[PDB]
Design an enzyme around this catalytic site. Structure first.
Site, PDB file in Angstrom:
ATOM      1  N   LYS A  53       0.791  -1.235   0.000  1.00 42.53           N
ATOM      2  CA  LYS A  53       0.000   0.000   0.000  1.00 42.53           C
ATOM      3  C   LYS A  53       0.822   1.283   0.000  1.00 42.53           C
ATOM      4  O   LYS A  53       0.276   2.361  -0.212  1.00 42.53           O
ATOM      5  CB  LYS A  53      -0.969   0.033   1.182  1.00 42.53           C
ATOM      6  CG  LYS A  53      -2.101  -0.967   1.103  1.00 42.53           C
ATOM      7  CD  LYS A  53      -2.906  -0.831  -0.188  1.00 42.53           C
ATOM      8  CE  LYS A  53      -4.327  -1.357   0.005  1.00 42.53           C
ATOM      9  NZ  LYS A  53      -4.219  -2.662   0.702  1.00 42.53           N
ATOM     10  N   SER A  95      -2.988 -12.459   4.008  1.00 41.96           N
ATOM     11  CA  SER A  95      -3.378 -12.470   2.598  1.00 41.96           C
ATOM     12  C   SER A  95      -2.335 -13.195   1.747  1.00 41.96           C
ATOM     13  O   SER A  95      -2.670 -13.804   0.732  1.00 41.96           O
ATOM     14  CB  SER A  95      -3.577 -11.039   2.073  1.00 41.96           C
ATOM     15  OG  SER A  95      -2.370 -10.303   2.108  1.00 41.96           O
TER      16      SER A  95
HETATM   17  C1  LIG Z   1      -4.084  -3.753  -0.086  1.00 47.00           C
HETATM   18  C2  LIG Z   1      -3.879  -5.210   0.332  1.00 47.00           C
HETATM   19  C3  LIG Z   1      -4.215  -6.244  -0.563  1.00 47.00           C
HETATM   20  C4  LIG Z   1      -4.818  -5.981  -1.984  1.00 47.00           C
HETATM   21  O1  LIG Z   1      -4.068  -5.107  -2.921  1.00 47.00           O
HETATM   22  P1  LIG Z   1      -4.969  -4.136  -3.800  1.00 47.00           P
HETATM   23  O2  LIG Z   1      -4.047  -3.433  -4.836  1.00 47.00           O
HETATM   24  O3  LIG Z   1      -5.580  -3.109  -2.920  1.00 47.00           O
HETATM   25  O4  LIG Z   1      -5.870  -5.021  -4.571  1.00 47.00           O
HETATM   26  C5  LIG Z   1      -4.024  -7.551  -0.188  1.00 47.00           C
HETATM   27  N1  LIG Z   1      -3.503  -7.854   1.052  1.00 47.00           N
HETATM   28  C6  LIG Z   1      -3.165  -6.865   1.933  1.00 47.00           C
HETATM   29  C7  LIG Z   1      -2.578  -7.267   3.299  1.00 47.00           C
HETATM   30  C8  LIG Z   1      -3.352  -5.529   1.579  1.00 47.00           C
HETATM   31  O5  LIG Z   1      -3.028  -4.533   2.457  1.00 47.00           O
END
Ligand SMILES: *Cc1c(COP(=O)(O)O)cnc(C)c1O
Ligand SMILES: *Cc1c(COP(=O)(O)O)cnc(C)c1O
Lengths: 302, 302
Positions: free
Chosen positions: B40, B263
């Protein structure tokens, strides 16, 4: 490429808000951007790679490595052991925080909790016992020359190049002594006038001729003079107080966008003092050992 | 150079233990090595820099920025606002963990805790109210094109170059949609056959035609289809369960030395499935949004 290959080549940023016009420039190398989260990734990798080169170890063997540490060195060793297939055992006092234990165990390190009353002494003894019983390899971070070499071959060159060989003073909060010795020698061999200044906790000021003591700068100020610290390189020693460093660390986060660790606050505070002494046209370089991520439950950010 | 200049140029590592011989190569780009701790940092910087370029903002002005987020975007925005002199206000449900609040406040972000029962809805409403009352700038991460552009101009090129233009499939767990859209377009413009696969929580499988729901993959799977997600780019969608991803994340830490976020476990699990489908001579690329550092108090590592 594997994780060990992602170690190093960290950026250096110039402070702009916590500094004053009458100060020399202050640059900070961010070692918290390493895969293991700290500058210790370098010596951890080097000590293990050095052992492989000397024939003590060979990757993927499942051989045992043991070290009495629960700090950044433990995290770095755990990361490397996980990646290269070694069984790592870390000894540490039983009063270790659950947070840190979870990080080490996440990497698969086996933890041996020793007598909480005997502190570091009991941890060292158990590590030695295991080395003897298992014929294991003990990095021995405070006396292993490969620790120093990591900084002489990577950290030092990186810093020198990034700052275009223009450095009037190098400031660092010594732990094992590897960084200040490795970077220090590298810089002095190329910059005739460069000053190498060590930073230590006023509460455990042994380099200043004082006495060891409990302090809050995790990772630095071991309370003794390590074999890896070359005292002949030092041009001075600055003592720092948590009372001054912690508020400065918070300023760095809020004003520079630099969320750093406890030792970083002490190191930068010292660097500022040196910067004021040298003045406007000079350049002071220092290193941030790690980020603030592991310290959200400490008085620094709590 | 300032902290915003330390964003990007992250390394890519090839998995070697959790993969099997019948699988295509699996490469993982480590975005947790950014100064803000996650991918981010890129969209946070881009949305702010884009606003400066358009004349909405000018650094060092103390102008107000407001965004309804307590996640990685909030951390990235906080870092940039601290460095460039903006007043940042983040709105979020009152049930936010103290750990996360401490990180945001360390960067100097002002937090507005909203109705815990109204969840994200109340946070969005307060952000809109503040934007109106203060004439503040709201990045609007789910619909701001600069989010996508950050990945089209940096993340995508980096990945392509590192893997020498040899990528058969790109796998990512979508949140705002910026990454998969930016990287996806960049790769498809250069690799005719490349497949772009989105990953989402089986528990909040809206891209698969299912229903939104509570899940543990912090940062991905928002429960809706964001404006920044270009559905025409997708070649498929893989649903993942925490029951499968969390153990895999622990394996990555213990076997690859890769301590990643929640994630990341879901994304890599999906990447492995794709890798088995493509086979030995192919190359699957995916991205790790962040490291495990912010998740030691979650079921993933607790
Ligand atoms: C932002 C984020 C995502 C997804 O990325 P995007 O470009 O916003 O689709 C996935 N996992 C985590 C931990 C994130 O902070
Ligand atoms: C290791 C460490 C230091 C000291 O570096 P050495 O090369 O061991 O002198 C300082 N701060 C932290 C947080 C550390 O982990």
């Amino acid at each position: 490429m594997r994780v060990e290959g992602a170690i190093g080549k960290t950026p250096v940023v110039r402070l702009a808000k916590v500094v004053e016009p009458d100060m020399a420039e202050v640059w900070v190398k961010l070692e918290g951007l390493n895969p293991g989260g700290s500058i210790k990734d370098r010596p951890a990798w080097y000590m293990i790679k050095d052992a492989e080169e000397r024939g003590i170890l060979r990757p993927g063997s499942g051989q045992v490595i043991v070290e009495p540490t629960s700090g950044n060195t433990g995290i770095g060793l755990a990361m490397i052991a996980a990646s290269r297939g070694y069984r790592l055992i870390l000894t540490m006092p039983a009063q270790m925080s659950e947070e840190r234990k979870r990080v080490l165990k996440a990497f698969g390190a086996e933890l041996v909790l020793t007598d909480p009353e005997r502190r570091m002494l009991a941890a060292r003894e158990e590590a030695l016992r295991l080395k003897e019983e298992l014929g294991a390899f003990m990095p021995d971070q405070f006396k292993n020359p490969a620790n120093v070499r990591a900084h002489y071959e990577t950290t030092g060159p990186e810093l020198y190049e990034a700052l275009e060989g223009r450095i009037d003073a190098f400031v660092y909060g010594s732990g094992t002594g590897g960084t200040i010795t490795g970077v220090g020698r590298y810089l002095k061999e190329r910059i005739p006038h460069v000053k190498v200044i060590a930073v230590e906790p006023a509460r455990s000021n042994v380099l200043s001729g004082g006495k060891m003591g409990q302090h809050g700068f995790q990772g630095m100020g071991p309370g003794f003079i390590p074999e890896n610290l070359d005292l002949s390189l030092l041009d001075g020693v600055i003592q720092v107080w948590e009372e001054d460093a912690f508020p400065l660390a918070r300023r760095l986060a809020r004003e520079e966008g630099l969320f750093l660790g406890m030792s970083s606050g002490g190191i930068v505070w010292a660097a500022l003092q040196v910067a004021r002494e040298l003045g406007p046209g000079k350049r002071v370089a220092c290193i941030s050992p790690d980020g603030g991520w592991k310290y959200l439950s400490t008085p620094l950010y709590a």
